[PDB]
């Protein structure tokens, strides 16, 4: 997967000059697997709503992993198990 630093996902092919790139490079500038974080556009990994531990940290609370065919997923790191203490 490819992370671009501080760009918007609509402006990825304009600021990378996708017309002059190789045909194998152009699949990593757009497509269905596009995620928008606070660090920039992550293209190559799908986003899931679950929360796990951190495997490959990206930034701004995002950690990628290699989950199940297998593919690269992205999520938000979990700080810990939610707990409550009954106070009286």
């Amino acid at each position: 997967a490819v992370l671009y630093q501080d760009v918007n996902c609509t402006d990825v092919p304009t600021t990378l000059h996708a017309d002059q790139l190789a045909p194998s490079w152009r699949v990593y500038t757009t497509g269905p697997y596009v995620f928008q974080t606070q660090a920039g556009c992550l293209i190559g990994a799908e986003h899931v709503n679950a929360s796990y531990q951190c495997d490959i940290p990206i930034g701004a609370g995002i950690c990628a992993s290699y989950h199940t065919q297998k593919s690269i997923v992205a999520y938000t790191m979990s700080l810990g198990a939610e707990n409550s203490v009954a106070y009286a």
Partner: protein, 435 residues
């Protein structure tokens, strides 16, 4: 030799302690700093190819370590305790320390005041690439830093996760006390926690229950005083500001050091390759490459030294969090000036601000004392406290509060023969057994 001062009142003081935790993670591209997008220079840099990854194996060694400083400090609990719905823990007001559920923000009032005091908008912490392409914004410093291949990587933990960590820590301190650092959290009312913390100073627990309202009012007034003191002042977080200023000025110096020609005929690769043929253009470009490697080397060395200093500060912060927050510390002048009671952590940009709650005695009084009292040939020594005289009677008190008690046999232990103790006096000891 027979005079002692015993305090008669006290005060509760809340003090601040600001320590940095991490600095700005930086990455450097060898190409687009040494060879300015020219094909003739990139064919010569390969001979120095082993001199570049050694930089990138160092600057990438700091940055991951910069994500180890934070999680050692804040992520000291494996449980995320939810914030209680009430803020009145037996008179002690925790409203401005804990997050407000009726607000869109996830940070408390003092945390909000600590932000908007460190001007983070001096470096390239938040700068989009859309406005960097055109307009007058190309005259900015950050645009030049980005065009020369000098970026700043974002941190792993955001401010919301750190605020959640601090809120969980304060909630665990309020609802459980010192016992949630050992194993599972054990609930206890806050008055009992204050009484037990008072009992670990040298003050008996009857003092708190007779002065609960005064201590609550003093704590609330101290919190209101420190909260207002963060708005009128202008310089209180200079430690956190110096890190940002140093990093920004180092990056700006590294950018501005590209105007030196290093002994060549020009400081740019374009007017050298467009004037001299390839016979003698390779002896001027190589001087520029060997001169521009030294700037990167010096920057990496200074970043490593600053990273070591920041790591030392982060280790001290982690020790202070483990010792002065999860429990009560007996080390003198470690957290707060005086007798430590408890502490509260607050987040700040690349730093932690500790609020230490401390007990200080205020009003003294002269007294005449004695080392021991012997009654019928046998010497009596105080178990816990000192013998004292108010002018006509002799009592036994504690060392940190004037609470006179009648000398009985339940607070004294016997020894000696009062022929060997220097300064012993004659007095009677009350016996609580008489039919």
């Amino acid at each position: 030799n027979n005079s002692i001062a015993i305090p008669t009142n006290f005060s509760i003081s809340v003090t601040t302690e600001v320590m940095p935790v991490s600095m700005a993670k930086t990455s450097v591209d060898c190409t687009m700093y040494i060879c300015g997008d020219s094909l003739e220079c990139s064919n010569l840099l390969l001979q120095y190819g082993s001199f570049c990854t050694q930089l990138n194996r160092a600057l990438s060694g700091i940055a991951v370590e910069q994500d180890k400083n934070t999680q050692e400090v804040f992520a000291q609990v494996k449980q995320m305790y939810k914030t209680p719905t009430i803020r009145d823990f037996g008179g002690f007001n925790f409203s401005q320390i804990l997050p407000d559920p009726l607000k869109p923000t996830k940070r408390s009032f003092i945390e909000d005041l600590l932000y908007n005091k460190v001007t983070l908008a001096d470096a390239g912490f938040m700068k989009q690439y859309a406005d960097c392409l055109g307009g007058i914004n190309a005259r900015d410093l950050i645009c030049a830093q980005k065009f020369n291949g000098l970026t700043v990587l974002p941190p792993l933990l955001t401010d919301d996760m750190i605020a959640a960590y601090t809120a969980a820590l304060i909630s665990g301190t309020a609802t459980a006390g010192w016992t949630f650092g050992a194993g599972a959290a054990l609930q206890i009312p806050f008055a009992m926690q204050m009484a037990y913390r008072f009992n670990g100073i040298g003050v008996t627990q009857n003092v708190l229950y007779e002065n609960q309202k005064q201590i609550a009012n003093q704590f609330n007034k101290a919190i209101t005083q420190i909260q207002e003191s963060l708005t009128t002042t202008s310089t209180a977080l200079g430690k956190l500001q110096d890190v940002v200023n140093q990093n920004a000025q180092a990056l700006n110096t590294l950018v501005k050091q590209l105007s030196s020609n290093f002994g060549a005929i020009s400081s740019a690769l374009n007017d050298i390759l467009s004037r001299l043929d390839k016979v003698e253009a390779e002896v001027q470009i190589d001087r520029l490459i060997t001169g521009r490697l030294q700037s990167l080397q010096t920057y990496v060395t200074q970043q490593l030294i600053r990273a070591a200093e920041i790591r030392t500060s982060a280790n001290l912060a982690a020790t202070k969090m483990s010792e002065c927050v999860l429990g009560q510390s007996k080390r003198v002048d470690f957290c707060g000036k005086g007798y430590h009671l408890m502490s509260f952590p607050q987040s700040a940009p690349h730093g932690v601000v500790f609020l230490h709650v401390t007990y200080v005695p205020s009003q003294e009084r002269n007294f005449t004392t004695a080392p021991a009292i012997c009654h019928e040939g046998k010497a009596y020594f105080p178990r816990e406290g000192v013998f004292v005289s108010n002018g006509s009677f002799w009592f036994i008190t504690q060392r940190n509060f004037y609470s006179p008690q009648i000398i009985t046999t339940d607070n004294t232990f016997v020894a000696g023969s009062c022929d060997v103790v220097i300064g012993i006096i004659n007095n009677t000891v009350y016996d609580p057994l008489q039919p």
